Structure formats: C-alpha cells, structure tokens
Motif scaffolding. Sequence first.
Motif, PDB file in Angstrom:
ATOM      1  N   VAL A  36      -6.675  -2.271  -0.657  1.00 24.92           N
ATOM      2  CA  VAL A  36      -7.803  -1.459  -1.090  1.00 24.92           C
ATOM      3  C   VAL A  36      -8.970  -2.357  -1.457  1.00 24.92           C
ATOM      4  O   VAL A  36      -8.806  -3.379  -2.134  1.00 24.92           O
ATOM      5  CB  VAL A  36      -7.410  -0.538  -2.256  1.00 24.92           C
ATOM      6  CG1 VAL A  36      -8.633   0.219  -2.763  1.00 24.92           C
ATOM      7  CG2 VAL A  36      -6.317   0.425  -1.805  1.00 24.92           C
ATOM      8  N   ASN A  47      -2.159  -5.749  -1.611  1.00 21.41           N
ATOM      9  CA  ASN A  47      -2.718  -4.418  -1.438  1.00 21.41           C
ATOM     10  C   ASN A  47      -4.089  -4.519  -0.780  1.00 21.41           C
ATOM     11  O   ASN A  47      -4.894  -5.384  -1.133  1.00 21.41           O
ATOM     12  CB  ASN A  47      -2.807  -3.724  -2.789  1.00 21.41           C
ATOM     13  CG  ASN A  47      -3.484  -2.391  -2.693  1.00 21.41           C
ATOM     14  OD1 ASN A  47      -4.705  -2.284  -2.873  1.00 21.41           O
ATOM     15  ND2 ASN A  47      -2.715  -1.366  -2.350  1.00 21.41           N
ATOM     16  N   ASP A  55      -9.408   6.383   2.950  1.00 20.78           N
ATOM     17  CA  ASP A  55      -9.987   6.329   1.609  1.00 20.78           C
ATOM     18  C   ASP A  55      -8.872   6.525   0.583  1.00 20.78           C
ATOM     19  O   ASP A  55      -7.687   6.496   0.927  1.00 20.78           O
ATOM     20  CB  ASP A  55     -11.182   7.275   1.474  1.00 20.78           C
ATOM     21  CG  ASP A  55     -10.852   8.699   1.806  1.00 20.78           C
ATOM     22  OD1 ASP A  55      -9.659   9.026   1.898  1.00 20.78           O
ATOM     23  OD2 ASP A  55     -11.795   9.504   1.975  1.00 20.78           O
ATOM     24  N   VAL A  56      -9.233   6.660  -0.692  1.00 16.76           N
ATOM     25  CA  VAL A  56      -8.253   6.493  -1.757  1.00 16.76           C
ATOM     26  C   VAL A  56      -8.490   7.526  -2.838  1.00 16.76           C
ATOM     27  O   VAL A  56      -9.630   7.743  -3.266  1.00 16.76           O
ATOM     28  CB  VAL A  56      -8.307   5.078  -2.375  1.00 16.76           C
ATOM     29  CG1 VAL A  56      -7.172   4.882  -3.386  1.00 16.76           C
ATOM     30  CG2 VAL A  56      -8.264   4.011  -1.304  1.00 16.76           C
ATOM     31  N   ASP A  80       0.848  -1.182   0.000  1.00 17.62           N
ATOM     32  CA  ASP A  80       0.000   0.000   0.000  1.00 17.62           C
ATOM     33  C   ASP A  80       0.886   1.235   0.000  1.00 17.62           C
ATOM     34  O   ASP A  80       1.902   1.294   0.712  1.00 17.62           O
ATOM     35  CB  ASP A  80      -0.920   0.033   1.236  1.00 17.62           C
ATOM     36  CG  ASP A  80      -2.046  -0.995   1.182  1.00 17.62           C
ATOM     37  OD1 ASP A  80      -1.783  -2.178   0.871  1.00 17.62           O
ATOM     38  OD2 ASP A  80      -3.206  -0.615   1.448  1.00 17.62           O
ATOM     39  N   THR A 100     -11.820   1.970   0.013  1.00 18.60           N
ATOM     40  CA  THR A 100     -11.271   2.161   1.343  1.00 18.60           C
ATOM     41  C   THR A 100     -10.095   1.221   1.514  1.00 18.60           C
ATOM     42  O   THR A 100      -9.895   0.289   0.737  1.00 18.60           O
ATOM     43  CB  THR A 100     -12.321   1.910   2.433  1.00 18.60           C
ATOM     44  OG1 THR A 100     -12.805   0.563   2.334  1.00 18.60           O
ATOM     45  CG2 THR A 100     -13.488   2.889   2.310  1.00 18.60           C
ATOM     46  N   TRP A 101      -9.302   1.478   2.547  1.00 19.25           N
ATOM     47  CA  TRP A 101      -8.158   0.631   2.834  1.00 19.25           C
ATOM     48  C   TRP A 101      -7.986   0.562   4.338  1.00 19.25           C
ATOM     49  O   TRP A 101      -8.411   1.451   5.079  1.00 19.25           O
ATOM     50  CB  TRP A 101      -6.892   1.156   2.163  1.00 19.25           C
ATOM     51  CG  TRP A 101      -6.500   2.522   2.641  1.00 19.25           C
ATOM     52  CD1 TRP A 101      -7.007   3.716   2.236  1.00 19.25           C
ATOM     53  CD2 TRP A 101      -5.507   2.822   3.616  1.00 19.25           C
ATOM     54  NE1 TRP A 101      -6.405   4.749   2.905  1.00 19.25           N
ATOM     55  CE2 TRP A 101      -5.468   4.223   3.756  1.00 19.25           C
ATOM     56  CE3 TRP A 101      -4.643   2.041   4.388  1.00 19.25           C
ATOM     57  CZ2 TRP A 101      -4.581   4.858   4.628  1.00 19.25           C
ATOM     58  CZ3 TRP A 101      -3.760   2.672   5.243  1.00 19.25           C
ATOM     59  CH2 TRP A 101      -3.746   4.065   5.369  1.00 19.25           C
ATOM     60  N   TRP A 137       0.401   4.697   1.229  1.00 22.73           N
ATOM     61  CA  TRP A 137      -0.508   5.481   2.048  1.00 22.73           C
ATOM     62  C   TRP A 137       0.232   6.657   2.657  1.00 22.73           C
ATOM     63  O   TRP A 137       1.442   6.596   2.905  1.00 22.73           O
ATOM     64  CB  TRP A 137      -1.234   4.649   3.124  1.00 22.73           C
ATOM     65  CG  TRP A 137      -0.418   4.214   4.317  1.00 22.73           C
ATOM     66  CD1 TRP A 137       0.147   2.992   4.530  1.00 22.73           C
ATOM     67  CD2 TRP A 137      -0.125   4.999   5.485  1.00 22.73           C
ATOM     68  NE1 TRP A 137       0.778   2.974   5.753  1.00 22.73           N
ATOM     69  CE2 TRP A 137       0.614   4.191   6.361  1.00 22.73           C
ATOM     70  CE3 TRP A 137      -0.436   6.304   5.878  1.00 22.73           C
ATOM     71  CZ2 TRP A 137       1.074   4.657   7.594  1.00 22.73           C
ATOM     72  CZ3 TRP A 137       0.018   6.760   7.093  1.00 22.73           C
ATOM     73  CH2 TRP A 137       0.760   5.940   7.941  1.00 22.73           C
ATOM     74  N   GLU A 147      -3.350   6.233  -0.977  1.00 21.12           N
ATOM     75  CA  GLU A 147      -4.284   5.883   0.078  1.00 21.12           C
ATOM     76  C   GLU A 147      -4.153   6.932   1.173  1.00 21.12           C
ATOM     77  O   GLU A 147      -3.107   7.066   1.806  1.00 21.12           O
ATOM     78  CB  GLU A 147      -3.970   4.471   0.553  1.00 21.12           C
ATOM     79  CG  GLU A 147      -4.063   3.472  -0.607  1.00 21.12           C
ATOM     80  CD  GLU A 147      -3.626   2.091  -0.233  1.00 21.12           C
ATOM     81  OE1 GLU A 147      -3.070   1.360  -1.091  1.00 21.12           O
ATOM     82  OE2 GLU A 147      -3.839   1.747   0.944  1.00 21.12           O
TER      83      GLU A 147
END
Length: 330
Positions: free
Chosen positions: A136, A134, A88-89, A40, A74-75, A42, A107
């Motif tokens: 997400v 990942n 969120d993304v 990810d 979302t993650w 982020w 992210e």
Amino acid sequence: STGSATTTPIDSLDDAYITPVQIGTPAQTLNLDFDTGSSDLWVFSSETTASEVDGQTIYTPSKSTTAKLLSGATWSISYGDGSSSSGDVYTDTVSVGGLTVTGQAVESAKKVSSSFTEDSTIDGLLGLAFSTLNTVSPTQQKTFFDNAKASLDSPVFTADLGYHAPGTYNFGFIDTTAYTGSITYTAVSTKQGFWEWTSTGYAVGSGTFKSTSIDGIADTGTTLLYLPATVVSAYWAQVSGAKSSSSVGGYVFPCSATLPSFTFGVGSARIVIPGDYIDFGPISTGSSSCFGGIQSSAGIGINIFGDVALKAAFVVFNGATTPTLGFASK
C-alpha cells in the motif's frame, strides 16, 4: 485472544487452501488464500472490473457500516507466478476464526490478472509475511497478524495444512494435540520480508541424509517445493523415467511410478514428505505424464518451502520480537 479457522484445499491436488474470513458489518464472508509469502490482504470486490470476476464472492464496502475509504491509498502486487492485482484500500473489521481486528486495511481489487479470474474458489489473499512487504502506497499497512499480535495470548500463528483434507490456521496459541513429538525451532531472517530460514539438509527416500545449508522461505501461498537444482536432480534421479521437460516447465514423471519420500532438516530434526505428496497428477487431462511436486528454484532466486513441504508438518510462525519458525511432525 485467540482464533482458529479451518483451511480447505481448493481442489483434489491441494493446489491452494482457502480459509473463511469475515469482513465488515454485517459480516461478508470471503474465502481467502492465507499466504505467508506476501503481506497484502486483498479481495475481489464490487470495484473489480466486471469482466475479471467469474464466480468469486465479492466484498462490497458500501454495504459495511464499519468500512472507511483509506483516502489516497492504492496497492499493486505481482506474485512469483506472474499473477498480479491492484486497487484502492478501505479499513474495516476483519475476523478470522473468532479473532477480530478493527481498522484492518482491506485492499479492494479494481484489477486482477487472468489466473485470479480463472480460479473461482479464491476470493482474495490474506498475507502473513512481514509488513515491510505490504504494497500500500503512500502509507504502508500492517498485516492481519501484525494488527492482532498485541491482543493475542501469544504472538504466534500456526499452519497445519492437510494432505487431501482440511487443516487449521490458529492464532495466538499452540495446539499441543495437533502434532507428535516436539517442535524444533529455527532462526528466521526478516531481511527480505519473508519467513526465511535455513534447512540443515535433505534425504531422498531411504537414502543417507546430506548435511547442507538450504536457505529458503516458508510460503503457504506457493503450492510446490522449490529447491536447488542439485537437490532436485538427486531426487528425480530415483524415479525411473523422470525428466526435466522444458516444454512442460519442470520435472515430470510416469504416472505409473511410486515416488520416494523427501526428508528435510530442521536443526537436528527431520520432516518427512511422503512420496504421494509429491505427485501433482497428469500434466493435462488423461496424460500418463505427471507433474512433480519438487522443482528447481534455479530460475526463481530463492528456495521455497511451499505447501508440499509445509503440509508434512505442524508449523509455528513465532512473531516475537525476534521471530522464529517451528516445525513438528504430525
């Protein structure tokens, strides 16, 4: 295309390394922890709970003309050290060392755990494991490397981490001036989503090499070297006064000790970790008990070739159709 960026230790112990990353238009530069053990990308953001931001640089998607919300995405991630983050993304343009990916999933953290808040030097993570990890949802997203791969001169990136010094992440090329000797390549299993490989054995100090298969992962996002209890016991037995402390959480040793090197096998080749790389300093300020850089993996479930091991080598992450890892001395 290629990219090349300097990576810098966050503190005097090399606890982690940060690399500047340009996100959005105009660029917002954040210092990210490149992590070959996760997938990810982020960031701390304008959406992060205000009480959970303490000195980090934030990404503000509303100030980027190329940012677009990835609707519904979302993650949420939990790391091996117990830390976590979620949000969120957006998609946006992301550049590392001159290499640009458009449409990268960025992210944005709404929540981060306390360990992230408490580290003002790390503005987020850039995952470089396989995209199957990942987080997400409902549409899994690709890593920066996966997105860049097709454009790169060669589908590779390299990690050249420094000992108490800056180093380099390169994308798309091998810098043949950055290592000595030859690079030994070894097979990778992607079954768990990691750069998982099998070391051929180890030696402690000037001792004889023990040939034994040690499956583990190459993880730039983990500080220490986590190995089977038998191996770790054999190492610390060569340090007078070293012991495993349940209260501290691992092997400790007298700060007055000189540590032996630790060698690990890569095929028929050998990477030597100098003893000084295994010293992680006083367990608390002013203590004469020091924390060891080689620790047991027994409670993890996997062996981890973290920064202690990787910074002794020039490491090639070969993302060809059948991935492999390469190690050279340097």
